[PDB]
């Protein structure tokens, strides 16, 4: 039982995730500066915070 | 019509934020607000 669920998590399903939807500082989100993703983000209603 | 709203700051329900400071008076998916002292 110990060994079969021992398993770390690791982020999936994207950005759809809401695991990590609300930020903190634990983890870190990056992208490139002055790119397409940021355009994509800055223009999103959801993806605002 | 027109008519006037009360409102109060709520954790999910109304958050009051700041004034946009690249758009320059508020992004999508907001509202103006004011507010007395």
Same mark, same amino acid.
């Given at each position: 039982?110990? !060994?079969?669920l021992?398993? &770390?998590?690791?982020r999936? =399903?994207?950005?759809?995730?809401?695991? !990590?939807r609300? &930020? +903190?500082?634990?983890?870190? #989100?990056? =992208?490139?500066?002055q +790119? +397409?993703?940021?355009? #994509?983000?800055?223009?999103?209603?959801? !993806? +605002? =915070? | 019509?027109?008519?006037? @709203?009360?409102?109060?700051?709520?954790?999910?329900?109304? @958050?009051?934020?700041? /004034?946009?400071?690249?758009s320059?008076?508020?992004?999508?998916?907001? /509202?103006?607000?004011?507010?007395? @002292?």
């Amino acid at each position: 039982a110990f !060994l079969v669920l021992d398993r &770390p998590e690791e982020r999936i =399903t994207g950005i759809n995730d809401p695991r !990590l939807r609300n &930020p +903190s500082d634990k983890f870190i #989100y990056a =992208t490139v500066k002055q +790119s +397409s993703v940021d355009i #994509y983000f800055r223009r999103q209603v959801e !993806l +605002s =915070t | 019509d027109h008519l006037s @709203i009360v409102t109060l700051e709520e954790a999910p329900f109304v @958050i009051v934020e700041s /004034v946009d400071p690249l758009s320059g008076t508020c992004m999508r998916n907001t /509202v103006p607000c004011q507010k007395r @002292i």
